[PDB]
Amino acid sequence: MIQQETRLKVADNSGAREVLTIKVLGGSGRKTANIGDVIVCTVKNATPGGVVKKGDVVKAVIVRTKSGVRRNDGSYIKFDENACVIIRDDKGPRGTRIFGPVARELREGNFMKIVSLAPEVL
Amino acid sequence: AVPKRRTSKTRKNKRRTHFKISVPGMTECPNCGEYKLSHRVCKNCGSY
Amino acid sequence: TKGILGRKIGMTQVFGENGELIPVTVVEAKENVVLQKKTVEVDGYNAIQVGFEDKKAYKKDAKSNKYANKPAEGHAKKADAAPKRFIREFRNVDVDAYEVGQEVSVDTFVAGDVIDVTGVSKGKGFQGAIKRHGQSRGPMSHGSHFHRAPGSVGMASDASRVFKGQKMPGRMGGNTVTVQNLEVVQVDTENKVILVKGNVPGPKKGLVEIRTSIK
């Protein structure tokens, strides 16, 4: 569950460090989001140098929420923090060096570029 | 919050047609005594 | 076609093929007999009626419902049978099968069939407006004295009355409801149960009516 005005951590080297959501896009009346959904957000904290600068309005994809996902066999997965990767709207990333583990469920979001760059996919 | 008209004698009497009371159970004390209440114990005026 | 009666037992889960997990309601459908065949000539519509669960015979000083009475005895004797508790009618079936006095066994359904289930709901008692209907509640601070009441109930003096169908509080309660397009997943013959995929209305040891899907 990720609403508007939730802080997320950014998990690549694109320059941003923390971000907060403006809309959960999708359909009208949409309220929350999970792993594999795309949100639109503003950077609140940045690394000096880097591509993105503080105050930019970007689009991003959710990896690893805290309340995770149910799978068809009745298995679950859960993480300790919320994370996020800024995309170029091709469903391709801005940075190059995704950090931390990434959930499997965005394989079928056509995010294969993100899956290949990452460490352990569980 | 306050009644707009008084209530007549008929409308008062139609209202309390169910404001009644019922007769009790009334079994008997078969050994010795007068009537007791049903599923109770005939202690006084009763031996059951 | 394919009507049967039974009562709810509980709810479990079953691992399907390739490890998929599916929630399952188990229904015991035991000792159903055909009890009267109705006809368009005699009655005006074709149907059969089915009795579900048998009960004890006639006794002289019965004080409850688990003994049949004399009207129920003679009705359940004209078809050679024991007196039943629940009796319903099924007018979707073909009436040219089902001789009177047959036992409709539990394996008239095969795994894979789509069905509809009918029962009465749980029942909640006297309930207010935000529980019984899905109403939004008022603010809980900032000086409000409006929390769980309903809102306005009409206009001012044009329409100096309240229209009907206004959604006030009252008895939430259990009334009849059907769910559609379920499935039969596994039929057990020895225990005489049916496993259906999903959940059905009613409390435990209730009464459900299973019949085939109309769509």
Partner: protein, 114 residues
């Protein structure tokens, strides 16, 4: 004995070959993944946090730190997608539910042996 018809129906779908464990033990779970064409197996190693439920609907949960990030993972006990479970190390704890490990870090979140 939940209800006589419930255990009679779901008896056949209940595995037998699993070892015994209680929370605080370290387990290696060989789970098998159907890929696009193959049936590749993968191992998940962690510490058992809890066990709950009864009968067919039993469930346990193991916890792992992958890349500085804690990962919980939760399974049905009798599922056919778990191939094998090994008990790597016995533990010495005093709770039935080990939820206090969620708010620890470093070497402070360690469990003794036996």
């Amino acid at each position: 004995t939940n209800h006589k018809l419930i255990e009679a129906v779901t008896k056949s779908q209940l595995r037998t070959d699993l070892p015994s464990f209680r929370p605080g033990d370290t387990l290696r779970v060989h789970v098998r993944i159907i890929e696009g064409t193959r049936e590749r197996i993968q191992v998940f190693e962690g510490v058992v946090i809890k066990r709950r439920g009864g009968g067919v609907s039993e469930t346990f949960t193991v916890r792992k730190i992958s890349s500085g990030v804690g990962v919980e993972r939760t399974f049905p006990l009798h599922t056919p997608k778990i191939e094998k479970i090994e008990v790597k190390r016995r533990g010495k704890v005093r709770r039935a539910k080990l939820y206090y490990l969620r708010s620890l870090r470093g070497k402070a979140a360690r469990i003794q042996e036996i």
